[PDB]
């Protein structure tokens, strides 16, 4: 019954797609869907229309959206499969958070850069340490693969 909750979370994104966030029925399955999360606002990777593919295995009520970057992206919360450590999806999730919600929050990892939660052994490091790795590269990917 998860997909039918995703009916809002995912499809509410399709009901009214503003900016830096859009998903919806891709395979027409609510477990294989494509969200375009963007640098566009004030972001280290501004310009970067990133790509998130999300899948669900019959989760609801508790629907943990494994929302994963299709592309490459340097940031402590994104490990090398695009899978994000996002509080509202790991700690603060409830059946009241649309992807219409989470997409902006994930956008906020490109937009808001949080210096807190380390998911990846290195990528968390290169973020809060190898300032080069985080900005230059993920913004370069922004230029190359996203934009």
User: What domains are there in the chain, each with its CATH number?
Assistant: 1-147 (3.10.110.10)
Fill in the DSSP letter of residue 64.
Answer: -
φ, ψ for residue 80, nearest 5 deg: -60, 15
Residue 38 backbone dihedrals phi, psi, to 5 degrees? -125, 145
Q: Report, as residue numbers or ranges, the catalytic residues.
A: 85
Strands (E), the chain: 33-38, 49-55, 66-69, 78-79, 83-84
CB atoms near residue 134 (< 10 Å): 23
27's CB contacts (< 8 A; 6+ apart) are 33
d(CA 68, CA 147): 18
Name the experimental technique: NMR
Encoded tokens for 142: 């922004």
Among 52, 31, 145, smallest CA distance to 105 is for 52
Per DSSP, the three-state class of 145 is helix
Q: Are 46 and 63 within 8 A, CB to CB?
A: no
């Amino acid at each position: 019954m998860a997909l039918k909750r995703i009916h809002k979370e995912l499809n509410d994104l399709a009901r009214d797609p503003p900016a830096q966030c859009s998903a919806g029925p891709v395979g027409d399955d609510m477990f294989h869907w494509q969200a375009t999360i963007m640098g566009p606002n004030d972001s280290p990777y501004q310009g970067g229309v990133f790509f998130l593919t999300i899948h669900f295995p019959t989760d609801y009520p508790f629907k943990p959206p494994k929302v994963a970057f299709t592309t490459r992206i340097y940031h402590p919360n994104i490990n090398s499969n695009g899978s994000i450590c996002l509080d509202i999806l790991r700690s603060q999730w409830s059946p009241a958070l649309t992807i219409s919600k989470v997409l902006l929050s994930i956008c906020s990892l490109l937009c808001d850069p949080n210096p807190d939660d380390p998911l990846v052994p290195e990528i968390a490091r290169i973020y809060k340490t190898d300032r080069e790795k985080y900005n230059r590269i993920a913004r370069e990917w922004t230029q190359k693969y996203a934009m």
